[PDB]
Amino acid sequence: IGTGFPFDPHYVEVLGERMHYVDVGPRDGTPVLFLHGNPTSSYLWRNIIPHVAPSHRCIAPDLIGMGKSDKPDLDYFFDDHVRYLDAFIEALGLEEVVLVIHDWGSALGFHWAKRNPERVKGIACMEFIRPFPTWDEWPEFARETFQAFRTADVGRELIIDQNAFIEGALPKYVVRPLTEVEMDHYREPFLKPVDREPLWRFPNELPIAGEPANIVALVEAYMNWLHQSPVPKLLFWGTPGFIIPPAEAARLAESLPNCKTVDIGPGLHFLQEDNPDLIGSEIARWLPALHH
């Protein structure tokens, strides 16, 4: 599995701040927009993009406060990310897109699709955010971890002061061991502790046990949209998975219209780090029939 990031940097200024992004492939078609989540960056997509770039434009931004993007002193609420990504998409002049989304990138992507349904020609998703109506829906062995993340004292200590999301959760939810070179690419945005604010606000925004109410309502809304939308969908899942276990992937296969599911083998949350070549090859194979 490749550890390098052989993508030229691109930058766009939106809402006073520079956002970094990958931009490769042809300009005369429908772009494929790749949205990472917490605590990652476009680095997460590095081994997937090369499968898709031959046929389609690949655009992979670093969310505001993450990756090589600028790091304003924001609260980094979901709503902040929405503002920055909405502006990013318009700054690039995108019209119709295909989305490839994970974690908070999936909340952003599904929320954008719900608001812009005629501009979404397909959604490839994996380990995506859905409501967890009670802590019981949450993976058992991570309930204590995320309950502690979701506090103003202990959660800040762990995630900001001790970098637990990077040093702990990230490698814990990849089945294969991440290498030190890969870990250094994920560490680099967050070398200064104060810059870890998004890594803490994100778990506090997760729709779990009814809280926070604004995010539960928005996530419920995009999931209701998704369940009624005819848009083509490609859902990657692993075993045991994390926020989409195998049984949920199978329910979604039956319940979401025009949905193809792909078993990637072993995986937890960051499926891209366990089987990037199958994810990329399957996205590439699925794109042509979306054009018409």
Q: Which residues bind Cl ion (CB under 5 A)?
A: 38, 202-203
Catalytic residue among 269, 273, 274, 282: 269
Nearer to Cl ion by Cβ, of 38 and 42: the residue is 38
Who's near 270: CB < 8 A, 6+ residues apart?
A: 40, 44, 102, 127, 170, 173, 174
Nearer to Cl ion by Cβ, of 31 and 67: the residue is 67
Minimum CB–partner distance for residue 202 and Cl ion (Å): 4
Give the span between the Cα atoms of 291 and 262, in whole angstroms: 21
Catalytic residue among 70, 80, 127, 197: 127
Nearer to Cl ion by Cβ, of 38 and 163: the residue is 38
Pairing of strands 32-35, 58-61: parallel
- Which helix (H) or strand (E) is 239 found in, with range? strand 233-240
Nearer to Cl ion by Cβ, of 7 and 202: the residue is 202
Minimum CB–partner distance for residue 212 and Cl ion (Å): 13
Pairing of strands 32-35, 97-102: parallel
Does residue 122 contact residue 231 with C-beta atoms inside 8 Å? yes
Question: Cα torsion for 24, 11, 6, 183, to the nearest 10°?
Answer: -130
Minimum CB–partner distance for residue 128 and Cl ion (Å): 12
Catalytic residue among 62, 70, 80, 103: 103
The dihedrals phi and psi of 97, each to the nearest 5 degrees, come to -140, 165
Who's near 215: CB < 8 A, 6+ residues apart?
A: 78, 107, 205, 206, 207
Q: Is residue 282 among the annotated active site residues?
A: no
DSSP character string of 5-49: -----EEEEETTEEEEEEEES-SSS--EEEE--TT--GGGGTTTH
The dihedrals phi and psi of 23, each to the nearest 5 degrees, come to -145, 100
Q: Is residue 269 among the annotated active site residues?
A: yes
Minimum CB–partner distance for residue 149 and Cl ion (Å): 8
Nearer to Cl ion by Cβ, of 105 and 203: the residue is 203
Nearer to Cl ion by Cβ, of 203 and 207: the residue is 203
3-class SS of residue 133: coil
Q: Is residue 102 among the annotated active site residues?
A: no
Minimum CB–partner distance for residue 206 and Cl ion (Å): 6
Minimum CB–partner distance for residue 204 and Cl ion (Å): 8
Does residue 80 contact residue 64 with C-beta atoms inside 8 Å? yes
Residues with catalytic function: 103, 127, 269
